[PDB]
Design an enzyme around this catalytic site. Sequence first.
Site, PDB file in Angstrom:
ATOM      1  CG  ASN B  77      -1.968  -1.177   1.147  1.00 48.68           C
ATOM      2  OD1 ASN B  77      -1.814  -2.082   1.489  1.00 48.68           O
ATOM      3  ND2 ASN B  77      -3.242  -0.411   0.901  1.00 48.68           N
ATOM      4  CB  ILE B  84      -0.812   5.819   2.416  1.00 47.70           C
ATOM      5  CG1 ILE B  84       0.649   5.712   3.054  1.00 47.70           C
ATOM      6  CG2 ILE B  84      -1.589   4.621   2.951  1.00 47.70           C
ATOM      7  CD1 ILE B  84       0.371   6.450   4.627  1.00 47.70           C
ATOM      8  CB  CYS B  85      -2.884   2.838  -2.067  1.00 47.51           C
ATOM      9  SG  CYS B  85      -4.523   2.324  -3.092  1.00 47.51           S
ATOM     10  CG  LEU B  86      -6.416   3.850   4.028  1.00 46.13           C
ATOM     11  CD1 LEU B  86      -6.821   2.497   4.133  1.00 46.13           C
ATOM     12  CD2 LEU B  86      -5.652   4.361   5.238  1.00 46.13           C
ATOM     13  CE  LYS B  90      -6.854   5.055  -3.084  1.00 48.60           C
ATOM     14  NZ  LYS B  90      -7.920   4.039  -2.872  1.00 48.60           N
TER      15      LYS B  90
END
Lengths: 138, 146
Positions: B77, B84-86, B90
């Site tokens: 992530n 950070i991909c969360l 978003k």
Amino acid sequence: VKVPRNFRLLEELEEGQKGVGDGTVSWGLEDDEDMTLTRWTGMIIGPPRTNYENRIYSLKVECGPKYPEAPPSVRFVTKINMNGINNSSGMVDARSIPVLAKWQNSYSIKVVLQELRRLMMSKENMKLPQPPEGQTYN
Amino acid sequence: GLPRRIIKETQRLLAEPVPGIKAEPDESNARYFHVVIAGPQDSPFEGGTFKLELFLPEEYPMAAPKVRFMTKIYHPNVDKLGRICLDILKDKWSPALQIRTVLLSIQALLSAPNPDDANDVAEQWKTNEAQAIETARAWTRLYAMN
């Protein structure tokens, strides 16, 4: 609202990827895995009706640890004859460029590159003899 | 004016910290937080201490907080610039959520990574988990101990 360096430069990275409309200036990371977000490349298209017209200028921009409180460093890779640009190193003399001489923390890489492009438009620079196209500094 | 919600969240972070997480506002910038998350027990990141930065943008809480890992970490992530991909950072953010939710979510991401999203590390975690875990352990030893 103060944006700290590490988030400001990620904003400038996304803006550079989006680009300005007409491609007349561009910027991006020199190494897109550079965690420190310190070294950038810039591109200026020489403005029309000047001795720079149509030429593509490549630049190096350094955003140090205190940016944007402190101004960035700027160097032309492409040889250019223009007030404030050292004719053997390509380094930009901050005293000679108003946006750098009077730097404010709201300014950005985009603003610096746009200011340099506007300055090539000036009576003092627009007729300066230029080197043979394509030349660069050592 | 500094929104009352930010003042109250800051007070709450100081008074009731999240276990395993330190989070302190920057002396010069009330919207800027320095965070440290301990590597969760039994995870590849055990024994490490991970630095993050968090920033509350102009439109907070209508817009999500922005968060960046500063310590090099090997994780499905977290990209190579620490982004950070969360989902709740978003699409799924809402003002019902708060800073403490984001911090707890990142800790949870480290404790038990879930590689479904899409990137090289997530792919390794899916089809070559043993190697991904060993690399995460190696990078914890190298970058999250000093």
